[PDB]
């Protein structure tokens, strides 16, 4: 077993998050194929095909049986470092690895910022709207 | 980096030498004694006691001139650590996992041995006491 906050780094871990995933045998975007691509299942009650790259925290919905999780990812997140990582886990130098666990945590933080933002703008729109209704 | 893999790190091994009656001037310095896997596990009757983080051998009676690597090789020859030539960070995740797998083995080995000694001790106290009854 490895320290919990590092499992995501481990494919079989990822695979294991897809529970009740629907695109299975025959589909191009099976849990397995999602996993080699970096996704983890984050099903919302209102978003049950919700999945994100454990590294570059991008989320994605709208999965069709024909969807290649890889080229999808390079489309919507071209600058994910994971994607340039061509070595299995154990084949990496703790150096190489500790460096990536560094982008991840940085990337993570940059996503919680562009999220606090998006939640600020949202609240502004409602303050604005509300003012206009009180000016008529 | 978690809290069970730290031992694996020189800096953390040094971080463990609290007192350590031996410093500048000595050859048995905290740096050289952590560069051989030691961690300071001081006590009342053992304020200078060290230990391998890997093999677990415990060693007392240190003197300024004592070369920790040597004391280590000549008190534990079967310690994968001593053969580890690469810097932590230049280790493969795989290799690193193999060492950790061996480390936990030795820890088992060591507590098993303890349980034997503890069991035999009791065996003697019990035998003796019973013998005395047949008299
Ligand atoms: Zn990604
Ligand atoms: Zn050792």
Curated annotation (Swiss-Prot), chain A:
List this protein's GO terms for biological process: apoptotic process; cell division; chromosome segregation; establishment of chromosome localization; G2/M transition of mitotic cell cycle; mitotic cell cycle; mitotic cytokinesis; mitotic spindle assembly
What effect is documented for mutating residue 44 to A/E?
Localizes normally during mitosis but cannot support cell proliferation. Increased affinity for CDCA8/borealin
Origin, by domain of life? Eukaryota
On whether Transcription is a keyword of this UniProt record, the answer is yes
PTM sites of type N6-acetyllysine? 19, 86, 106, 108, 111, 117, 125
Q: How the protein is affected by changing residue 125 to E?
A: Loss of acetylation; localization primarily within the cytoplasm; increased likelihood of existing as monomer; stronger binding to XPO1/CRM1
Q: Where are the BIR repeats?
A: 14-84
Which terms in the GO cellular component ontology are assigned? centriole; chromosome passenger complex; chromosome, centromeric region; cytoplasm; cytoplasmic microtubule; cytosol; interphase microtubule organizing center; kinetochore
From the Swiss-Prot or TrEMBL record, state where the protein is found: Cytoplasm; Nucleus; Chromosome; Chromosome, Centromere
Family classification: Belongs to the IAP family.
> Assembly and partners?
Monomer or homodimer. Exists as a homodimer in the apo state and as a monomer in the CPC-bound state. The monomer protects cells against apoptosis more efficiently than the dimer. Only the dimeric form is capable of enhancing tubulin stability in cells. When phosphorylated, interacts with LAMTOR5/HBXIP; the resulting complex binds pro-CASP9, as well as active CASP9, but much less efficiently.
Its recorded name reads Baculoviral IAP repeat-containing protein 5
Q: What is the lineage of its organism?
A: Eukaryota, Metazoa, Chordata, Craniata, Vertebrata
């Amino acid at each position: 077993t490895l320290p919990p906050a590092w499992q995501p780094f481990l494919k079989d871990h990822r695979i294991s998050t897809f529970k009740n995933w629907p695109f299975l045998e025959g589909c191009a975007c099976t849990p397995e194929r999602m996993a080699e691509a970096g996704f983890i299942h984050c099903p919302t009650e209102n978003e049950p095909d919700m999945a994100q790259c454990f590294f570059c925290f991008k989320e994605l919905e709208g999965w069709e049986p024909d969807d290649d999780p890889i080229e999808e990812h390079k489309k919507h997140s071209s600058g994910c470092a994971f994607l340039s990582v061509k070595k299995q886990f154990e084949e990496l130098t703790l150096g190489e690895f500790l460096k990536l666990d560094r982008e991840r945590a940085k990337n993570k933080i940059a996503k919680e910022t562009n999220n606090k933002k998006k939640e600020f703008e949202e609240t502004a729109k409602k303050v604005r709207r509300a003012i206009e209704q009180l000016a008529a």
